[PDB]
From a paper:
The transactive response DNA-binding protein-43 (TDP-43) is a multi-facet protein involved in phase separation, RNA-binding, and alternative splicing. In the context of neurodegenerative diseases, abnormal aggregation of TDP-43 has been linked to amyotrophic lateral sclerosis and frontotemporal lobar degeneration through the aggregation of its C-terminal domain. Here, we report a cryo-electron microscopy (cryo-EM)-based structural characterization of TDP-43 fibrils obtained from the full-length protein.
Morphology-1 has a width of 11.5 ± 0.8 nm and well-resolved cross-overs at a distance of 46.9 ± 4.5 nm (n = 50). Subjecting the cryo-EM images of Morphology-1 to a reconstruction of the three-dimensional (3D) map resulted in the subdivision of the extracted fibril segments during 3D classification. The two distinct 3D classes were identified and refined. We hereafter refer to these two structures as Morphologies-1a and 1b. The 3D maps reached spatial resolutions of 3.76 Å (Morphology-1a) and 4.05 Å (Morphology-1b), based on the 0.143 Fourier Shell Correlation (FSC) criterion. Morphology-1a is C2-symmetrical and consists of two structurally equal, in-register protein stacks. In the case of both Morhphology-1a and 1b, extra densities were observed near the contact sites of two protofilaments. We find that the majority (~66%) of the fibrils visible in our micrographs are mixed and contain segments from both structural forms. The segments of the two structural forms are not randomly scattered throughout the mixed fibrils but occur clustered into distinct z-axial regions of variable length. These features imply that Morphologies-1a and 1b do not represent systematically distinct fibril morphologies but sub-morphologies that are able to coexist in mixed fibrils. Despite these differences, we find the interfaces between the adjacent protein stacks to be formed by the same two amino acid residues (Met311 and Phe313) in the three fibrils.
Residue numbers in the entry:
A (entry chain D), B (entry chain F), C (entry chain H), D (entry chain J), E (entry chain L), F (entry chain B), ...: 304 to 348
The structure:
């Protein structure tokens, strides 16, 4: 069980994420004002 | 079970994400004002 | 079970995501004001 | 089970996503004000 | 089971997505104000 | 069980995260004003 | 010379004005979303 | 010379003005979302 | 010469003005979201 | 020459003005979110 | 020459002005979020 | 020549002004978040 309060952002967020990855499983998620991500990267041997 | 509060953003978000990946499974998700992502990248051997 | 609150964005989001990927499975999703994505990239050996 | 609240965006979103991919399976989805995508890219050996 | 709330966008979204792909299966979907896409790209060996 | 209070940010957050990873499982998530992420990267041998 | 800008009202205005007057000249004008009134009630002795 | 800027009101204005007057000249004007009134009540002795 | 800037009001204004007057000239103007009034009540002796 | 800047009000203004007057000239103006009034009540002896 | 800057009010202003007057000229103006008033009550003997 | 800077008020102003006057000229102006008033009450003998 999880919960988050609500917030207000007046400023302008200039985000410039730059990502690189190399794996058996890879997920790369960039988001702006609000987001939630639940990623289950299952693996065996 | 998950929950998120509601927020208000007056500023203009100029986002410029740049991503590169190399994997057996790859997902790359960029989004603006609001989003949710549940990605199950299942794998065996 | 997941839940998200509602938000209001007055600013104009100029997004310029640029993505590159190389995998057995690849998904690349860019979206503007609101979105949800549930991607199950199943894999065997 | 998933749920999303409703939001209002006054600003004009100029999005310019640019994507490139190379995989056994590839999906590339760009959308504007609202969207949902559930992509199951099944794979065997 | 999935659900989405309703939103209102006053701004004019000038979208210019540009996509390129090379795969055994390829789907590329660009849309404006509202959309949903469920793509099952099945694969064997 | 988790809970978070609500906050207000007047300043404009210019974030420039730059990330690189190399693993059997890799997740890299950059976000702006608000987010939550629960990632279970399961592994066997 | 007079001038007015244009506005947008999403809310539903339930107005219930109740007026009573007793004069040599009487005008009573109730209006909803938009209006202009120029009433010259001239009088002598 | 007069000038007014344009505004947007999301809330629902429930107005209930109640007015009573007794004069040689009487004007009573109730209005909702937008209005202008120029009333010249001229008088002599 | 007069000038006014433009504003946005999210809240719902419940106004309940109640007015009573007794004069040689009387004007009573109640309005909701936006208005301008220029009333010249001229008088002699 | 006069000038006013533009403002944003999130709160809901419940106004309840109550006014009473007795004069040779009387004007009573109640307004909600925005207004301007220029009243010249001219008088002689 | 006059000038005013622009401000933002998050709180809900519950105003309850109550006014009474008795004069040769009387003006009584109550307003909510923003206003300007220039009243010239001219008088002779 | 006059000038004012812009301010932000998070608190909810509950104002309850109560005024009474008796004069040859009377003006009584109550306002909420922002206002300007230039009243010239001219008089002779």
């Amino acid at each position: 069980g999880s919960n988050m309060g609500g917030g207000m952002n007046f400023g302008a967020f200039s985000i410039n994420p730059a990502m690189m990855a190399a794996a058996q499983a890879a997920l790369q998620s960039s988001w702006g004002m609000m987001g939630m991500l639940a990623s289950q990267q299952n693996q065996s041997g």
